[PDB]
Design a binder for this molecule. Sequence first.
Ligand code: HEM
Ligand SMILES: *[C@@H]1O[C@H](CO)[C@@H](O[C@@H]2O[C@H](CO)[C@@H](O[C@@H]3O[C@H](CO)[C@@H](O)[C@H](O)[C@@H]3O)[C@H](O)[C@H]2NC(C)=O)[C@H](O)[C@H]1NC(C)=O
Ligand SMILES: *[C@@H]1O[C@H](CO)[C@@H](O[C@@H]2O[C@H](CO)[C@@H](O)[C@H](O)[C@H]2NC(C)=O)[C@H](O)[C@H]1NC(C)=O
Ligand SMILES: *[C@H]1O[C@H](CO)[C@@H](O)[C@H](O)[C@@H]1O[C@H]1O[C@H](CO)[C@@H](O)[C@H](O)[C@@H]1O
Ligand SMILES: *[C@@H]1O[C@H](CO)[C@@H](O)[C@H](O)[C@H]1NC(C)=O
Ligand SMILES: *[C@H]1O[C@H](CO)[C@@H](O)[C@H](O)[C@@H]1O
Ligand SMILES: *[C@H]1O[C@H](CO)[C@@H](O)[C@H](O)[C@@H]1O
Ligand SMILES: *[C@H]1O[C@H](CO)[C@@H](O)[C@H](O)[C@@H]1O
Ligand SMILES: *[C@H]1O[C@H](CO)[C@@H](O)[C@H](O)[C@@H]1O
Ligand SMILES: *[C@H]1O[C@H](CO)[C@@H](O)[C@H](O)[C@@H]1O
Ligand SMILES: *[C@H]1O[C@H](CO)[C@@H](O)[C@H](O)[C@@H]1O
Ligand SMILES: *[C@H]1O[C@H](CO)[C@@H](O)[C@H](O)[C@@H]1O
Ligand SMILES: *[C@H]1O[C@H](CO)[C@@H](O)[C@H](O)[C@@H]1O
Ligand SMILES: *[C@H]1O[C@H](CO)[C@@H](O)[C@H](O)[C@@H]1O
Ligand SMILES: *[C@H]1O[C@H](CO)[C@@H](O)[C@H](O)[C@@H]1O
Ligand SMILES: [Mn+2]
Length: 299
Amino acid sequence: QEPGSGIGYPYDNNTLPYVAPGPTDSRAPCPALNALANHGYIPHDGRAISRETLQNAFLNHMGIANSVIELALTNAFVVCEYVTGSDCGDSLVNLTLLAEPHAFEHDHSFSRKDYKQGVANSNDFIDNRNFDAETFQTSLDVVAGKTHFDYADMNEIRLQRESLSNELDFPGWFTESKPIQNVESGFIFALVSDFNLPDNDENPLVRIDWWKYWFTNESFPYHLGWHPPSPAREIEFVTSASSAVLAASVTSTPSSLPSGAIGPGAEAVPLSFASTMTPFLLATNAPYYAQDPTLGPND
Ligand code: HEM
Ligand SMILES: *[C@@H]1O[C@H](CO)[C@@H](O[C@@H]2O[C@H](CO)[C@@H](O[C@@H]3O[C@H](CO)[C@@H](O)[C@H](O)[C@@H]3O)[C@H](O)[C@H]2NC(C)=O)[C@H](O)[C@H]1NC(C)=O
Ligand SMILES: *[C@@H]1O[C@H](CO)[C@@H](O[C@@H]2O[C@H](CO)[C@@H](O)[C@H](O)[C@H]2NC(C)=O)[C@H](O)[C@H]1NC(C)=O
Ligand SMILES: *[C@H]1O[C@H](CO)[C@@H](O)[C@H](O)[C@@H]1O[C@H]1O[C@H](CO)[C@@H](O)[C@H](O)[C@@H]1O
Ligand SMILES: *[C@@H]1O[C@H](CO)[C@@H](O)[C@H](O)[C@H]1NC(C)=O
Ligand SMILES: *[C@H]1O[C@H](CO)[C@@H](O)[C@H](O)[C@@H]1O
Ligand SMILES: *[C@H]1O[C@H](CO)[C@@H](O)[C@H](O)[C@@H]1O
Ligand SMILES: *[C@H]1O[C@H](CO)[C@@H](O)[C@H](O)[C@@H]1O
Ligand SMILES: *[C@H]1O[C@H](CO)[C@@H](O)[C@H](O)[C@@H]1O
Ligand SMILES: *[C@H]1O[C@H](CO)[C@@H](O)[C@H](O)[C@@H]1O
Ligand SMILES: *[C@H]1O[C@H](CO)[C@@H](O)[C@H](O)[C@@H]1O
Ligand SMILES: *[C@H]1O[C@H](CO)[C@@H](O)[C@H](O)[C@@H]1O
Ligand SMILES: *[C@H]1O[C@H](CO)[C@@H](O)[C@H](O)[C@@H]1O
Ligand SMILES: *[C@H]1O[C@H](CO)[C@@H](O)[C@H](O)[C@@H]1O
Ligand SMILES: *[C@H]1O[C@H](CO)[C@@H](O)[C@H](O)[C@@H]1O
Ligand SMILES: [Mn+2]
């Protein structure tokens, strides 16, 4: 928000306004990075981004400590080298390359379509990067009629998403990605769980309106009483939440689930790609921005 608005005070004392991305701006498959870029906490054009830029942006404007993004930074730069063909040093070329499929970007996302979702031909691909309202609605419908959801609910959501993706993706494309997705499940609990409840650290409950605002608008739900977590969330919270999601009991099992879908997931680790492997072509779509309604500087 505008620095003088005081909307972030006293959790964020140095805010910048929301600015919608233009047609030439680079955006990510990540709702967090997109929100940061929309506010210029990382470059608004989504290009040439250093580790420290990202660390400071997450810590000072989102209440997310350095520990939370340590692996994410490692993987971002691995994907950058893979996509571009050369070492990206400490300048991430752009955000768009992060939508390289079967890498950091993965299938059965909460709010994005899959790279080969519903395509009639093997070589075809679609926008697996921009926010997709229809996809996100499939996630929200699992918790329809609710204001909050827990670990068990999140587990049901990711299962529903896995089921839908396995059915809709071109035969052979679907690849389960529990370790990455459920770090991201942990991310959701870290950012938009209801810290106003007395037991937030034992059984954090996500506020659905906060989640919906963040994802749909790619800006921060301050108007709904949200603020950056204080103290900043640490990696321990995230991986514990991740483990708790996958450990939660399933009361409704979707069909067409991949093998081993229900149960614990592997620890997320650094990505690696063969030097001979050519990257998949990136979707070229203009960056998404909210239009119903469009957002003002303080939204
Ligand atoms: C530099 C650090 C980060 C990088 C490089 C990064 C990168 C990515 C990428 C490539 C995806 C796409 C995966 C997919 O859904 O197919 C993604 C998704 C996601 N990111 Fe990040 N991320 C970072 C930090 C964060 C943080 C700190 C949060 C929140 C605390 C966050 C929230 C999310 C969520 C919730 C998704 C899932 C979106 C969905 O499934 O629709 N990210 N991120
Ligand atoms: C973000 O950065 C990535 C990585 O540099 C960009 O993707 C790449 O964009 C270039 C065009 O600037 C593509 O190069 C072209 O390749 C085709 C086919 O090989 C060739 O006919 C052209 O002569 C040109 O060399 C490249 O394919 C593409 N990489 C991938 C894997 O898709 C991306 O455009 C950037 N996005 C934004 C919004 O800045
Ligand atoms: C995206 O952001 C917009 C702008 O903040 C939200 O629309 C506002 O919703 C709040 C509810 O707290 C109201 O006070 C305002 O009257 C709304 N403004 C306008 C112009 O509609 C919108 O709800 C957000 N989207 C989601 C899905 O959360
Ligand atoms: C991205 O651009 C490519 C051409 O540069 C196309 O081959 C792709 O289909 C894709 O096009 C989509 O996004 C662009 C924005 O760059 C739009 O102009 C197209 O209408 C399409 O949605
Ligand atoms: C914001 O400023 C107030 C008043 O000086 C201060 O008490 C608070 O600690 C500041 N917040 C942060 C996160 O620095
Ligand atoms: C989130 O983190 C937990 C603990 O590392 C994993 O078990 C899960 O697969 C996901 O990566
Ligand atoms: C989440 O998981 C990690 C290991 O993946 C632990 O280090 C952390 O304490 C938390 O249990
Ligand atoms: C790890 O941390 C999470 C979040 O604080 C808890 O919900 C979980 O029970 C475990 O202690
Ligand atoms: C990962 O961590 C969670 C929360 O502590 C457990 O529920 C799970 O069994 C696994 O150890
Ligand atoms: C986890 O617990 C539920 C009860 O809520 C059962 O339905 C399920 O079989 C599993 O034991
Ligand atoms: C068991 O409970 C879950 C909530 O965790 C529901 O999603 C499901 O429909 C069933 O009632
Ligand atoms: C749906 O069915 C699976 C087994 O296929 C269970 O693990 C789950 O608890 C739910 O009842
Ligand atoms: C229970 O919930 C699962 C996942 O949301 C559905 O796939 C199933 O149809 C039932 O409603
Ligand atoms: C990481 O691991 C892969 C193997 O999957 C190698 O191809 C790469 O060179 C790096 O060592
Ligand atoms: C987004 O842009 C529209 C104009 O199309 C405005 O009505 C709105 O206030 C927001 O700035
Ligand atoms: Mn995805």
